[PDB]
Design a protein around this ligand. Structure first.
Ligand SMILES: *[C@@H](C)[C@H]1/C(=C/c2[nH]c(/C=C3N=C(/C=C4\NC(=O)C(CC)=C4C)C(C)=C\3CCC(=O)O)c(CCC(=O)O)c2C)NC(=O)[C@@H]1C
Ligand SMILES: *[C@@H](C)[C@H]1/C(=C/c2[nH]c(/C=C3N=C(/C=C4\NC(=O)C(CC)=C4C)C(C)=C\3CCC(=O)O)c(CCC(=O)O)c2C)NC(=O)[C@@H]1C
Ligand SMILES: *[C@@H](C)[C@H]1/C(=C/c2[nH]c(/C=C3N=C(/C=C4\NC(=O)C(CC)=C4C)C(C)=C\3CCC(=O)O)c(CCC(=O)O)c2C)NC(=O)[C@@H]1C
Ligand SMILES: *[C@H](C)[C@H]1/C(=C/c2[nH]c(/C=C3N=C(/C=C4\NC(=O)C(CC)=C4C)C(C)=C\3CCC(=O)O)c(CCC(=O)O)c2C)NC(=O)[C@@H]1C
Ligand SMILES: *[C@H](C)[C@H]1/C(=C/c2[nH]c(/C=C3N=C(/C=C4\NC(=O)C(CC)=C4C)C(C)=C\3CCC(=O)O)c(CCC(=O)O)c2C)NC(=O)[C@@H]1C
Ligand SMILES: *[C@H](C)[C@H]1/C(=C/c2[nH]c(/C=C3N=C(/C=C4\NC(=O)C(CC)=C4C)C(C)=C\3CCC(=O)O)c(CCC(=O)O)c2C)NC(=O)[C@@H]1C
Ligand SMILES: *[C@H](C)[C@H]1/C(=C/c2[nH]c(/C=C3N=C(/C=C4\NC(=O)C(CC)=C4C)C(C)=C\3CCC(=O)O)c(CCC(=O)O)c2C)NC(=O)[C@@H]1C
Ligand SMILES: *[C@H](C)[C@H]1/C(=C/c2[nH]c(/C=C3N=C(/C=C4\NC(=O)C(CC)=C4C)C(C)=C\3CCC(=O)O)c(CCC(=O)O)c2C)NC(=O)[C@@H]1C
Ligand SMILES: *[C@H](C)[C@H]1/C(=C/c2[nH]c(/C=C3N=C(/C=C4\NC(=O)C(CC)=C4C)C(C)=C\3CCC(=O)O)c(CCC(=O)O)c2C)NC(=O)[C@@H]1C
Ligand SMILES: *[C@H](C)[C@H]1/C(=C/c2[nH]c(/C=C3N=C(/C=C4\NC(=O)C(CC)=C4C)C(C)=C\3CCC(=O)O)c(CCC(=O)O)c2C)NC(=O)[C@@H]1C
Ligand SMILES: *[C@H](C)[C@H]1/C(=C/c2[nH]c(/C=C3N=C(/C=C4\NC(=O)C(CC)=C4C)C(C)=C\3CCC(=O)O)c(CCC(=O)O)c2C)NC(=O)[C@@H]1C
Ligand SMILES: *[C@H](C)[C@H]1/C(=C/c2[nH]c(/C=C3N=C(/C=C4\NC(=O)C(CC)=C4C)C(C)=C\3CCC(=O)O)c(CCC(=O)O)c2C)NC(=O)[C@@H]1C
Ligand SMILES: *[C@H](C)[C@H]1/C(=C/c2[nH]c(/C=C3N=C(/C=C4\NC(=O)C(CC)=C4C)C(C)=C\3CCC(=O)O)c(CCC(=O)O)c2C)NC(=O)[C@@H]1C
Lengths: 289, 162, 172, 162, 172, 162, 172, 172
């Protein structure tokens, strides 16, 4: 599980929550809890205005005319969901969001993008939505009666890349999919295409370097090809991600975000220099063997 | 936001389809309506001051305690009277946007969504705004399609408030 | 998403002002072009498959490296994705033409496309070539004087060419 | 069925909304079109046998092997010729439905959805029906909005087949 | 769901026939009524809150047992649900009016409503009474001769009455 | 890429399981087949030019309008004949991959996925390729397991096209 | 994922070539080693629990900081997670051995594992030490000369060692 | 970085081809526009200070939160940085206009700028509004008919407008 780093990763509140199940012969308070959970999960913790509520679908859920899964399906196909997540997004962004909302995880591979992009293009948004909800994965985790929830913890069938990518899509508890630094941009287009991963940067409030994001071009690669040779005598190399660089000012400072590969023997100097740049350490990761 | 042109593309986009005769018809429906809307928006704009002030006074007349009672939510002082005229101005201006756009989109996004919480939080009676909206309906002097479309938006706001 | 009208309304609301007389006149001028706009959308749509297939045939002939074994458009899967992309772009170009605003093209199709192609090794320059072939084909179709009320569509044609050029630039 | 009226209501219902100016403008668009659509439908219906026989002969001319090759999928015997004429008649009749309905709904529901599986399963060439559809476009003698709407549906089928 | 047009189409398709000249002319006559239909939908929609509230007020005044403690419309949640249902039914009636066919109302709203109400203990006859009150108010609003081009709306008004009656019977 | 070995691991992985006797037997099945598959691949590869040329001619004889009709999709000129021989070469090559892989994986990934779009878009008859595949089945000279596995892949392609 | 056969195929298709005689011959040599490969998988799997538990015990003995209070393998939740991970890594190493291609191990297990452990504060160097211990036990089990048809498994044993090395290098 | 000429050369070397006749004639048409391009660069440059300061004045008048105490553009250092940034963006737009290719703007200016602003807390949507105002002023200056040889600069104006559009989109 996630224990020590749960709070700084924004996972602790989900560790403290149980799946929201609608039992047969449910009470009205049960129905209200499901409705609240579905709105929070499926709409990415956006505030929902009374004018935006799906009152008819809520009635049918309350009446047992539709199960939880069918209520999720209705919310996912609503003009409200599409306005929030479809009409203004690159389809790869849409697929990312669908996975997060409806399956509680991030896409694992480029194959998932191929499948859902073609399905949308050939059969339309509704058909694509059904594929998530009628999937084996949805059935195994949530079935007919449980609201979808974030699957942070390792499960059978997982891949490691899923874990790192969840923190590209989930940015903390007091946050929504439409209020994140990358805004409308696909978070995973490049990761999926290259099958690469990124160092995990936890949410703001609990991580000073929370804003670190790489640029389109001119990034430092993850691993130290060439080893310590360019640095001279050095025992081991680390990749440091740095954000919020301002102090020297333009043109001495061009990009406020920077990743550097530095040797063990210069980490003291590196931290000192970073502090004087005003920057905040986003992540440190071994870069050599 | 809800307009004929945006709904048409939103429908076709959701289906992953090129636009078809259905959407072309939607556009013709817009084109048949647009000039009357633009004409109505111009008339309301040129008359906005009289309308806003007339509507504000109509509310004070119908609910005289709003200009006699002390309170942050009332218009018994110049502060509250300015808020109220400001508010009515928002309704009138955003209604002209609907006439330009050809749908309720502007009202939906800028005014209606969340209006219930605001009126509750600051203790503002929806009835006050209904009376003002009724005044604008009675006094904008529009005719024909300009009138019908304009009154649909004014009633749309009235219904949302009630 | 914005259409020609909501774009102006959104800007006006952010400033808290009624639309000025000139703005209402510009929109009235846009309304007067509506029929031509609709015809252009209809004509492009009616020839969608030919526009895409011919452009693609021409691109591969010019750029045989795309379809040699190991080329980016080799294998049925990749060829299918390539044809699909061309149709997607054409589709959003007609949406933008229909709405009179490029936002739908930018938001749904173009925002993130260059990153996708760069990440996958898709030759964006070659996509831009294909888009240009669809552009030339589409404008010829929109301009055909036969079978339509005669008039001046140069303004609408320029706007459509702008959308194609925008698509081509976004991937190149 | 994708028609302007049903789509308008379905989108409104998705949002739990009464119909508004947007949907009323969809209706005016439909009304502007409908008389032309109905006139087109009558004209195609009155000329149906001529159009269908002409279209079948046009396919046989462009693809002579269809009337010369033995096989269940070809029209070398009267059995195959009858299937072929029936199929073309289906296309024409359903296109008239699209004109009456004001959208591709009937084509989508009755013919287009699943046509690929049929043409693949029974080894029918979509190019055959493209040719027939081109014949019909070039010989219905429609003018004006009727021509425009009829050809959009004929092109919709052609595009689907290619 | 069908509209007035596709209703005829579906009947013709199942018979494999083109629409007759008589059917087409019947649709043409429907088109000639379109403006009256649009006005009727607009007028009901414009007055929806008033129609519902006044009908609900009148209903409870005639049936105080609904709102006495233990009554089916007693407590805020149940009163709120009751008011919601009245608006849903009105909304769907306007949908049916807009399309010119009862299928939207029947298929989405009424189908299974009686069973829901019977299972809940909602008194169907009282719902039907409420629907009848809404019907009368709606018809008067539609027929109001002021501020509209004068003409005969008896055909459209009769159609709307039928839709309201369908709703009343479906739950009564 | 469906093959026995990758399918074995895929199923075990999705169940979170170590490989068991079930998957080991799958491996023994692959091993029983592998050498016959490799022999078949060799034989087809060595005889590829004759097979590809003969298959192309088989198509031309069965469908003589392909070598007589003008159009980008036909083989009337050397350009179209080169495309056609190329396509037949692709089918044969990828089939050899299947024999190497011991499954339809390579056909699924490199040829079948998307073939219907291509054939529709470029107006190519899948019947042309069926006849080419039938010629290859009739003439590759394989026997025993080599023949059966290879024919299964040829048939798999044939079934996909029909 | 790839296996040994489909790895060569994918490289061949990327170049549009039939497999060469030597490529086919090399794959035949692979087939000839198939039984030894199967035996190696069976032996690791049959001892999986012992391999994991013995390695975990040795690791915790050599690095007692891991299990002292506050250590990353302290508490039942974390110790269970630690034991699970060791089993997961072993499982995927066997998958790679079975298929003869590291892709299943790299794609599904190792890719992102370094970042994951850094994010969680799991000591990657210690994980690597655990993997090395499993490696030694597993190779000894694979090489056990008793109860099996005698022959030379040095090539298979080297391949399996390579997979364990990939795992060790990835976690740290 | 690319200019209009070397952009085309790059795409030709990638295919191992001499520039086609139409490509050479396209570049000649570009040369024929050279003077208009120089004039536009010169007019924007000559009015740079006013373009920036007027745009900034309009921005802070429409978005007064920026310059209230606690606003991102409050304090002299932040206001100075803000004014500097607008000038930087305008400068690179003139670079792109001068070369006839967006590469300099995209590579040297917009790369990582969105990321810089979010990391520092700079409101990018407000930066984009500033760019818009600079765009409006810049095009009017470029289109000014006074004191210059008369001709159609519509194509250069469209290109310049495009570069501003890129900038506005990139900063947020
Ligand atoms: C440039 C695109 C070409 C061009 C366009 C053009 N169109 C019109 C006028 C009309 N076009 C239509 C279109 C339709 N009617 C339908 O029923 C449908 C099918 C759903 C369509 C697409 C209509 C209704 C009109 C108005 C009536 C008429 O037919 O004239 C014009 C005339 C200007 C105007 O609209 O005021 C023009 C110029 N004309 C060309 O020559 C270009 C090649
Ligand atoms: C290194 C791995 C050790 C080794 C292996 C080895 N095995 C064989 C031969 C066989 N092993 C099997 C395995 C199984 N048969 C079954 O039914 C099952 C259960 C599903 C298993 C796991 C088989 C079928 C054979 C072939 C028949 C036989 O029993 O010999 C060999 C011999 C050479 C060959 O490749 O066939 C070898 C070398 N031998 C050692 O000495 C290493 C310690
Ligand atoms: C749109 C940009 C406006 C416009 C431009 C325009 N300019 C010319 C021609 C010329 N402009 C120059 C410019 C300069 N000469 C110098 O010595 C310098 C200072 C270093 C500059 C900037 C020159 C050399 C020419 C050519 C000779 C001439 O004076 O005409 C044209 C004519 C077309 C052409 O040159 O090909 C045009 C159209 N004209 C407008 O109306 C726009 C407002
Ligand atoms: C009010 C004093 C200021 C202000 C606020 C403002 N906030 C938002 C949007 C959001 N606020 C939150 C915060 C939370 N969501 C949670 O679930 C939690 C508890 C765990 C918190 C603290 C979120 C997530 C959002 C985004 C979601 C959404 O639906 O908006 C807005 C809306 C902004 C916009 O609509 O563009 C506003 C206006 N704004 C001010 O000007 C005040 C200073
Ligand atoms: C003005 C319209 C808005 C605004 C601006 C603003 N920017 C900064 C700080 C920086 N801006 C940059 C920009 C660039 N670096 C580059 O290399 C280029 C491209 C060539 C650009 C445009 C950088 C690097 C910084 C940081 C270093 C520096 O401050 O010089 C600030 C100050 C941030 C601070 O926290 O002090 C401001 C205020 N702010 C607004 O509110 C306007 C919308
Ligand atoms: C029927 C119950 C009542 C009635 C209706 C009626 N209406 C018309 C004509 C029109 N009504 C409209 C409606 C609108 N125009 C708009 O722009 C909008 C807002 C989006 C609406 C709702 C229109 C366009 C017309 C036609 C033009 C005109 O100026 O009239 C008629 C006349 C016949 C006809 O169908 O055209 C009638 C009868 N009239 C009554 O007396 C009833 C009380
Ligand atoms: C065709 C002219 C060129 C070409 C295209 C090509 N594209 C891909 C793959 C993808 N294309 C997209 C595109 C989009 N996703 C969206 O959301 C939208 C907007 C709605 C678009 C346009 C995506 C995301 C992918 C990845 C998924 C997929 O593969 O379908 C490929 C395949 C690349 C690969 O390695 O598989 C190809 C071939 N390639 C050329 O060579 C032509 C110049
Ligand atoms: C008293 C402070 C002021 C007042 C009261 C008033 N109320 C109504 C009507 C209703 N009151 C309720 C309230 C409830 N019903 C419930 O079941 C419960 C929860 C247990 C509550 C709180 C309701 C539902 C109604 C409407 C239906 C009904 O008539 O019962 C009226 C009449 C309103 C009308 O339009 O008929 C009045 C007068 N009015 C004042 O002016 C007082 C200051
Ligand atoms: C009001 C005139 C009468 C009344 C109504 C009443 N209804 C319910 C409960 C429900 N009503 C519905 C109906 C619908 N939901 C939909 O989505 C649609 C459109 C397809 C319809 C028609 C449903 C489903 C319910 C049950 C679930 C829910 O609570 O929403 C109640 C509450 C019953 C209870 O005990 O909770 C009431 C009070 N009751 C009267 O006494 C009036 C005659
Ligand atoms: C031969 C049986 C008949 C024939 C062939 C023909 N094919 C094309 C064009 C294409 N063929 C393919 C097929 C493939 N591409 C792949 O990547 C694969 C999988 C590995 C296959 C099976 C494709 C994609 C095309 C179009 C793109 C391209 O040019 O490569 C043509 C030309 C079609 C055109 O419009 O240019 C022809 C002539 N034609 C006959 O008449 C033969 C009977
Ligand atoms: C005492 C009743 C009997 C006994 C104990 C014994 N335990 C172990 C090994 C372990 N004990 C634990 C237990 C915990 N670790 C924790 O973090 C916590 C939660 C706070 C608990 C309860 C664990 C995890 C181990 C294994 C790892 C470790 O050594 O720490 C042993 C040794 C087992 C081995 O194989 O090394 C023994 C001997 N044994 C008896 O015979 C007593 C009756
Ligand atoms: C044991 C030798 C060491 C150790 C391990 C340890 N790991 C975790 C937590 C996780 N481990 C993983 C790993 C994977 N997830 C996957 O999907 C894959 C392949 C399928 C792998 C390898 C993950 C994702 C987690 C977090 C999620 C979860 O555990 O469900 C922990 C617990 C972390 C915590 O409690 O915060 C531990 C203890 N720790 C040591 O000290 C040993 C050296
Ligand atoms: C008063 C002595 C004379 C005067 C003043 C005047 N100032 C401005 C505009 C600005 N003043 C400032 C100054 C500051 N901004 C800060 O954040 C701080 C540090 C905390 C200071 C000192 C700035 C930045 C501006 C420009 C931006 C803004 O409007 O806030 C004006 C208006 C200038 C314009 O063009 O709008 C004026 C009039 N003018 C006189 O004539 C007085 C003698």
């Amino acid at each position: 599980a996630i224990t020590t780093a749960a709070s700084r990763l924004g996972v602790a509140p989900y560790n403290e929550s149980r799946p929201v199940e609608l039992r047969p012969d449910f009470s009205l308070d049960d129905a209200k809890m499901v409705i609240r959970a579905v709105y929070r999960q499926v709409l990415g913790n956006d505030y929902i205005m009374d004018s935006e509520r799906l009152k008819g679908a809520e009635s049918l859920l309350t009446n047992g005319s539709i199960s939880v899964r069918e209520f999720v399906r209705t919310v996912a196909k609503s003009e409200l969901y599409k306005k929030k997540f479809l009409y203004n997004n690159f389809q790869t962004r849409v697929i990312e969001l669908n996975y997060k909302h409806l399956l509680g995880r991030a896409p694992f591979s480029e194959d998932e993008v191929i499948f859902h992009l073609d399905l949308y293009e050939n059969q339309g948004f509704d058909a694509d939505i059904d594929s998530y909800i009628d999937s084996v994965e949805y059935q195994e985790n949530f079935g007919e009666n449980i609201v979808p929830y974030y699957r942070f913890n390792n499960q059978v069938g997982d891949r490691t890349v899923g874990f790192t990518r969840m923190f590209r899509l989930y940015r903390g508890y007091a946050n929504s999919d439409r209020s994140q630094l990358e805004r409308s941009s696909s978070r995973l287009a490049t990761e999926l295409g290259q099958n690469t991963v990124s160092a995990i940067v936890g949410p703001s409030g609990s991580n000073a370097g929370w804003a670190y994001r790489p640029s389109r071009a001119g990034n430092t690669p993850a691993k130290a090809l060439g080893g310590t040779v360019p640095f001279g005598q050095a025992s081991k190399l680390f990749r440091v991600e740095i954000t919020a660089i301002s102090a020297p000012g333009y043109p001495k400072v061009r990009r406020s975000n920077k990743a550097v590969i530095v040797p063990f023997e210069q980490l003291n100097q590196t931290l000192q220099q970073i502090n004087r740049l005003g920057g905040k350490v986003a992540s440190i990761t071994p870069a050599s063997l | 936001m809800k307009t004929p042109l945006t709904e048409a593309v939103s429908t076709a986009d959701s289906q992953g389809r090129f636009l078809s005769s259905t959407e072309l018809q939607i556009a013709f429906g817009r084109l048949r309506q647009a000039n009357a809307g633009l004409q109505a928006a111009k008339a309301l704009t040129d008359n906005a001051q009289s309308l806003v002030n007339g509507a504000a006074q109509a509310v004070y007349n119908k609910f005289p305690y709003t200009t006699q009672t002390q309170g942050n939510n009332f218009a018994a002082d110049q502060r509250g009277k300015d808020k109220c005229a400001r508010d009515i101005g928002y309704y009138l201006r955003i209604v002209t946007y609907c006439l330009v756009a050809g749908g309720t989109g502007p009202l939906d996004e800028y005014l209606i969504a969340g209006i219930d919480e605001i009126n509750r939080t600051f203790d503002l009676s929806p009835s006050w705004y209904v009376e003002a909206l009724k005044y604008i309906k009675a006094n904008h002097g529009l005719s024909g399609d300009a009138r019908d479309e304009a009154n649909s938006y004014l009633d749309y706001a009235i219904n949302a408030l009630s | 998403m914005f259409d020609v009208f909501t774009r102006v309304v959104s800007q006006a609301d952010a400033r808290g002002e009624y639309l000025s007389g000139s703005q209402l006149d510009a929109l009235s001028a846009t309304v007067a072009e509506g029929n031509k706009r609709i015809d252009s959308v209809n004509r492009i749509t009616g020839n969608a498959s030919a526009i895409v297939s011919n452009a693609a045939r021409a691109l591969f002939a010019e750029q045989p490296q795309l379809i040699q074994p190991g080329g980016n458009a080799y294998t049925s899967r990749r060829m299918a994705a390539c044809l699909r992309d061309m149709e997607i772009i054409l589709r959003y170009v007609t949406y933008a033409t229909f709405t009179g605003d490029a936002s739908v093209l930018e938001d749904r199709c173009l925002n993130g496309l260059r990153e996708t192609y760069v990440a996958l090794g898709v030759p964006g320059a070659s996509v831009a070539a294909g888009v240009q072939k669809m552009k030339e084909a589409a404008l010829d179709i929109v301009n055909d004087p036969n079978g339509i009320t005669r008039g001046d569509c140069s303004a609408i044609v320029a706007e459509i060419a702008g959308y194609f050029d925008r698509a081509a630039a976004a991937v190149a």
